[PDB]
Paper text:
α-1-Antitrypsin (or alpha-1-antitrypsin; A1AT; SERPINA1) is an abundant plasma glycoprotein secreted into the circulation by liver cells. We sought to develop a monoclonal antibody as a molecular probe capable of selectively recognizing M A1AT at the single-molecule level. In an initial antigen ELISA screen, 1 clone, 2H2, was found to produce antibodies with reactivity against M A1AT but little against the Z variant.
Antigen ELISA experiments showed that mAb2H2 recognized both monomeric and polymeric M A1AT with similar affinity, but there was poor recognition of either form of Z A1AT. Here, we have taken a multidisciplinary approach, involving the generation and validation of an antibody selective for A1AT with an endogenous Glu342 residue — the M and S variants — whose epitope was localized to a structural scaffold region of A1AT that is essentially unaltered during conformational change.
Residue numbers in the entry:
A (entry chain H): 1 to 52, 52A, 53 to 82, 82A, 82B, 82C, 83 to 98, 101 to 129, ...
B (entry chain L): 1 to 115, 117 to 163, 165 to 204, 206 to 216
Write the structure that this text describes.
Amino acid sequence: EVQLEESGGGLVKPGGSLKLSCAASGFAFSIYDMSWVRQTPEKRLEWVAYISSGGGTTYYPDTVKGRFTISRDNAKNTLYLQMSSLKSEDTAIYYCARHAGVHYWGQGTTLTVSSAKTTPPSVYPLAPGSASMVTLGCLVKGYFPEPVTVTWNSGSLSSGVHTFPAVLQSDLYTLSSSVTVPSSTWPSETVTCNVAHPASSTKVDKKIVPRD
Amino acid sequence: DIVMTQSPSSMYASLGERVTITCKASQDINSYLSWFQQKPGKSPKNLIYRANRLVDGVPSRFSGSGSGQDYSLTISSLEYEDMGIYYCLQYDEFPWTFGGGTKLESKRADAAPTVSIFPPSSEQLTSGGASVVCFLNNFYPKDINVKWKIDGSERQNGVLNSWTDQDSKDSTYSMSSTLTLTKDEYERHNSYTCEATHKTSTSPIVKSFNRNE
Ligand code: NA
Ligand code: NA
Ligand code: NA
Ligand code: NA
């Protein structure tokens, strides 16, 4: 059927530039008007740009007019969004939508606009204080950018896990993850949280050991 | 531009329940209003266009009505697959603008949190920081208050809270509350308490530890 696949997202400094692509297939890309729509971290949707089927005419809201350029290569069946003078407020998931998005949306590509430095997390074990189920924790502090992937015993502890949304602390992110296990299993059987931060190419393991 | 506002911001509902959500435009939009549903991790899907016209394939329990400035979406008998965020969209005038969304969530019985508190780890103290972490897991409703007490006195500064999305299996919520201090400040005090309060005047769910073990 119809495929709309966005690419090109990533981390960009404010003032920077980035060009997104939306590869279309499964229909005559040259006979529809295309659009970009974005979703902020606050889960608000906003129209970004609109272009005619031939690519000659474009329409923008005032928030991006003069900075964003929607274009298309009909011979390559590709829609584009050229962004310049990027602002932190442009941080969002960007979707390409056919026409008015009544039927076909892409899966989106994520843009983060920030000056913060890429940083691997510090991972700290959370063991219960020295005094049937036992809850353990994993503090994932001071990383940038999103995301991280937290698993417990390489995924084998999947139920009773709560990984909480990251919060802002300094110019970095912090989150914790909890795991709940029968008291008969830990500490006699090991529990370790695994933390993957692909942006820094790091994967750290932290064993949860009882407090002295 | 035209401003779209939706109500309510969020609501709980049970299986089979009739659900109506509303959407108001800052000016007359001539029924050029569409409704979208979005599930976590996925893109918005168009359910209704032109205020009351169903997109092909959308089940019969969905309907829309309204005119001018006031519009509504109705689910005649809720299904669990209907949970998510619903957005209205006006396309009477470019830029097409969205309402703020209505989060439709799952109703269940009240549940107290399982509270767990954790002293800072030795590793973190070596770096000079001290995060005291508290988990409130598997509670309902989502509106819960966390109160930190340090040697019996309430502490508000330095607390960062984070709330999960509703658990898709048991309809509960979980949240973490993290009190971050320097090592020196943390070691000035003895007892640390995390208190989960739902409604006022009820006894809290409390966990505590003494730094002097
Ligand atoms: Na242009
Ligand atoms: Na492991
Ligand atoms: Na801090
Ligand atoms: Na620290």
